[PDB]
Amino acid sequence: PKVAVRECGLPVSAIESLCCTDSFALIRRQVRETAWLKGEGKRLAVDLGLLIGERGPVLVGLRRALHTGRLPDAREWTPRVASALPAELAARVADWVTRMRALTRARRELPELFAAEARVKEKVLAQVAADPGFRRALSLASPELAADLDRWLAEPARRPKTQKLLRLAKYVARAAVKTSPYSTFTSMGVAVWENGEDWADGAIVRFAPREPPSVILEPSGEWLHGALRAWLARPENLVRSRLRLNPSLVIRADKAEFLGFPPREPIIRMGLTPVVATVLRLAEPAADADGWIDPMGFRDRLARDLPAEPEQVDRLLRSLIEAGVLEAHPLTRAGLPETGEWAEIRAALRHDPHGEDPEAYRVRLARLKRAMTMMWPQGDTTALLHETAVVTRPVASLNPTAWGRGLSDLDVVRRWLSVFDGKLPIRIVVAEYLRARYGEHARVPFLTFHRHVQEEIAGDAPSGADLRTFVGRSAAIWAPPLAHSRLPRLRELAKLREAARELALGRPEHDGIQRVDPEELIKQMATWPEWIVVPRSCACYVQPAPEGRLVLNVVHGGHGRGLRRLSHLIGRVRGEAVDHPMVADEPEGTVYAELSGSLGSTLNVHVPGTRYEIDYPFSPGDRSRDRRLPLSDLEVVLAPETGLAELRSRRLGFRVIPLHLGMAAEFQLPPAARFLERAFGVTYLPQEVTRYPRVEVGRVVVQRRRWLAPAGTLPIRAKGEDDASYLLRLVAWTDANGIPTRSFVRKPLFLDLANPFLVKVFERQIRDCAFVLFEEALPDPADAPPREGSDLPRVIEFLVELG
Numbered sequence: 001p002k003v004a005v006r007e008c009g010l011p012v013s014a015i016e017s018l019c020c021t022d023s024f025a026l027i028r029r030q031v032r033e034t035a036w037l038k039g040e041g042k043r044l045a046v047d048l049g050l051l052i053g054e055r056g057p058v059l060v061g062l063r064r065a066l067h068t069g070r071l072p073d074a075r076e077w078t079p080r081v082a083s084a085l086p087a088e089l090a091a092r093v094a095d096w097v098t099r100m101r102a103l104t105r106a107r108r109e110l111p112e113l114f115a116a117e118a119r120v121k122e123k124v125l126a127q128v129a130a131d132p133g134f135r136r137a138l139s140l141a142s143p144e145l146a147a148d149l150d151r152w153l154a155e156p157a158r159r160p161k162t163q164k165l166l167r168l169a170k171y172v173a174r175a176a177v178k179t180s181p182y183s184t185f186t187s188m189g190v191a192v193w194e195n196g197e198d199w200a201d202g203a204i205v206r207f208a209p210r211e212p213p214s215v216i217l218e219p220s221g222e223w224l225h226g227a228l229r230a231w232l233a234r235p236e237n238l239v240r241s242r243l244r245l246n247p248s249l250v251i252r253a254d255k256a257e258f259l260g261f262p263p264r265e266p267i268i269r270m271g272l273t274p275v276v277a278t279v280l281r282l283a284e285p286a287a288d289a290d291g292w293i294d295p296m297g298f299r300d301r302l303a304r305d306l307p308a309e310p311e312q313v314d315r316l317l318r319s320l321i322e323a324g325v326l327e328a329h330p331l332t333r334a335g336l337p338e339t340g341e342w343a344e345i346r347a348a349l350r351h352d353p354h355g356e357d358p359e360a361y362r363v364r365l366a367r368l369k370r371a372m373t374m375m376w377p378q379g380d381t382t383a384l385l386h387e388t389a390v391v392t393r394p395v396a397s398l399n400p401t402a403w404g405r406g407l408s409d410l411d412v413v414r415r416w417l418s419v420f421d422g423k424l425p426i427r428i429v430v431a432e433y434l435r436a437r438y439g440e441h442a443r444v445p446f447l448t449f450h451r452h453v454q455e456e457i458a459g460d461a462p463s464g465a466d467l468r469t470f471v472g473r474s475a476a477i478w479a480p481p482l483a484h485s486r487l488p489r490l491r492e493l494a495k496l497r498e499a500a501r502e503l504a505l506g507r508p509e510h511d512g513i514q515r516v517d518p519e520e521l522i523k524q525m526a527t528w529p530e531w532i533v534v535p536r537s538c539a540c541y542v543q544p545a546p547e548g549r550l551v552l553n554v555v556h557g558g559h560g561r562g563l564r565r566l567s568h569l570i571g572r573v574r575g576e577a578v579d580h581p582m583v584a585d586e587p588e589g590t591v592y593a594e595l596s597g598s599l600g601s602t603l604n605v606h607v608p609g610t611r612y613e614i615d616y617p618f619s620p621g622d623r624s625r626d627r628r629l630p631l632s633d634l635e636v637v638l639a640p641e642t643g644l645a646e647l648r649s650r651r652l653g654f655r656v657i658p659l660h661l662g663m664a665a666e667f668q669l670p671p672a673a674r675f676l677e678r679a680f681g682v683t684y685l686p687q688e689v690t691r692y693p694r695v696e697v698g699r700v701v702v703q704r705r706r707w708l709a710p711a712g713t714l715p716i717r718a719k720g721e722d723d724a725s726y727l728l729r730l731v732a733w734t735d736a737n738g739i740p741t742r743s744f745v746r747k748p749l750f751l752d753l754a755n756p757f758l759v760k761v762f763e764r765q766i767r768d769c770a771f772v773l774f775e776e777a778l779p780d781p782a783d784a785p786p787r788e789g790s791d792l793p794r795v796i797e798f799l800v801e802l803g
């Protein structure tokens with residue numbers, strides 16, 4: 001079970017140190033003492049009223065004060081009144097009055113204490129934000145705010161505006177508690193399993209001495225490919241290019257059908273002249289041993305098979321390239337040969353930054369950005385540069401006996417979550433289209449199927465209705481409109497989902513936890529029909545929590561997706577590749593094949609991890625010609641076992657399972673690739689305060705405890721000069737509703753009520769919000785796994801690949 005670890009770049013002490021510990025402890029005492037006094041007051045009013053009617057004024061007024069929570073008037077609580085009561089009631093009343101008086105004075109003290117503590121935390125914020133790793137991450141993410149931080153550090157007691165402080169505090173929180181790839185903010189490395197036995201400890205994990213992260217700077221894939229195509233279109237770079245036939249090209253005995261340039265990937269049908277048709281035929285023998293076509297020898301080769309005239313062998317070739325039938329690619333791995341502008345880019349990208357302070361980093365990046373735009377425009381490209389932080393040595397060892405039950409529970413969970421996959425309706429609808437248009441035993445060239453489906457989506461007919469609903473632009477009509485659908489299997493799916501949900505939720509809440517036994521989900525699964533197929537491998541992102549819990553954040557496709565990028569980034573930093581193991585082709589008659597090349601994204605560059613590959617129009621791969629399945633070679637058939645559409649190689653017979661193993665999001669995939677993944681891939685991806693409990697499937701936390709608060713329930717700073725009195729009212733409301741001190745509020749906001757910065761960020765974000773969802777912080781930052789020496793505890797997250 002292959003494992004990686006993502007670690008926050010700031011230690012937990014970084015956000016702990018921003019808490020106003022003294023005044024919050026007093027805010028908490030006050031809130032609990034106010035609630036206890038008000039409760040006790042009302043109970044003492046009951047007992048006093050009993051006493052009143054046991055006799056048969058003053059008492060009626062004292063009663064009224066206790067009931068309503070105010071100090072009794074001097075005339076309502078006197079030695080005589082205390083005399084007319086039973087000693088135990090008199091003493092209870094006495095204690096209440098004392099405590100009420102103490103509470104009132106402590107209410108008066110609080111605002112100066114809190115204000116003074118909050119203000120001291122301003123300098124603690126700069127202390128925490130001084131970290132070099134953090135300033136570097138911030139410098140990429142937010143350069144002006146980062147320069148302002150650098151000035152603050154150089155000029156202390158140059159107290160920046162509140163709004164800058166809130167922005168800094170938010171990034172600090174991100175870097176201390178959020179395990180998302182955002183830039184130097186977190187870093188990633190591999191974990192290993194270490195010899196049970198050595199864990200008398202009790203630890204589930206043990207960390208090596210902290211390796212300083214190494215950083216890899218990369219250009220926007222979209223920038224890169226726009227600039228590359230620009231260069232490949234210029235006449236002089238034909239001799240610096242190789243050519244190949246577009247692997248979507250299909251000659252339909254008359255016309256050429258193919259897919260054109262990304263990102264709008266038009267489906268193209270064009271008329272062949274007999275000369276163009278012969279040009280396309282002679283591309284075959286003109287090809288390399290690996291399919292590439294030397295353009296010079298091809299222009300001659302054409303000169304002496306057509307008539308001679310080179311002047312128009314060139315324009316004909318040019319017209320084929322501009323059209324997309326023949327693809328121009330550069331001569332070398334990643335970038336262009338060594339042309340002037342490209343070797344500067346490539347070197348500046350590669351520049352080892354060592355010893356560089358954040359201001360020099362900012363300067364350097366701004367300069368690189370310019371050279372990029374004085375070459376191909378940014379356009380609407382958001383971010384021209386990304387950075388990623390990795391470590392080269394294993395970061396941690398894992399305790400295989402303490403992990404054990406958790407991984408077992410996780411596998412059961414991983415399988416059961418298949419029923420919820422947002423691609424299942426797609427599969428069902430696509431399969432039904434196949435059956436309806438072409439017949440149960442039909443075998444449809446993939447490209448013709450893609451075109452037909454796309455025609456249905458663009459047009460108007462009821463034959464296209466389901467495709468438009470589930471495969472078209474839309475999440476659905478309202479929610480995924482199953483249950484009341486024409487297709488039986490969409491309705492069977494809806495009931496299978498409802499039964500899955502009701503099995504999970506049909507159980508008691510004890511201490512805010514509903515606990516599902518994994519064997520219950522195994523029992524439910526043995527019942528499912530064959531058209532729910534469980535992926536063979538999943539990347540499970542989990543965070544450990546107390547009592548051996550794994551909190552599941554995210555599942556995606558496995559097969560090394562994620563890990564393969566990590567191996568390739570480590571390989572770049574070390575200067576030697578990591579042999580990530582290959583995907584096994586199984587059962588016989590089935591192969592797994594990733595899409596060739598990187599499909600326009602730097603997040604798809606990785607250890608090539610499938611034997612064969614789907615050879616994809618403008619995204620050449622790195623495989624022997626015999627190991628390429630061109631789009632032209634794929635067909636779509638209905639499988640008898642599942643009744644779902646599958647892919648076959650016409651040339652070789654195998655069932656072909658398309659894989660996306662790069663880290664590009666599915667919407668960044670060009671259209672036919674997106675369709676392949678969505679349709680053929682085997683991965684998945686009121687009126688008062690309402691509490692939803694946490695849901696665990698033995699030790700795997702599948703849903704964290706939550707609290708839903710409508711707009712109207714949540715305290716609002718009355719801008720009648722409200723100040724710290726606000727925190728008091730907010731903490732009174734949260735405590736009364738069981739909302740913990742630390743939570744993630746809905747990208748979720750980390751809220752520490754003790755942190756004066758995060759409370760204000762919270763105040764500001766939630767205005768004009770219809771609902772506010774609080775989620776327990778689990779693991780809590782305080783629960784971060786311990787360390788040795790001077791390495792401070794950090795929040796972490798594991799990528800665990802389960803197979």
Ligand SMILES: Nc1ncnc2c1ncn2[C@@H]1O[C@H](COP(=O)(O)O)[C@@H](NC(=O)[C@@H](N)CCC(=O)O)[C@H]1O
Nearest residue numbers: 178179180541553554744747748775776777778779
């Ligand atoms: N209830 C809660 N308890 C405790 N930790 C919570 C948490 N909710 C989020 N986290 C953390 O913060 C992160 C979301 O913040 P954001 O990056 O989306 O803005 C989470 N990270 C992830 O889920 C990762 N899979 C990466 C997600 C991605 O790539 O977008 C958590 O680390």
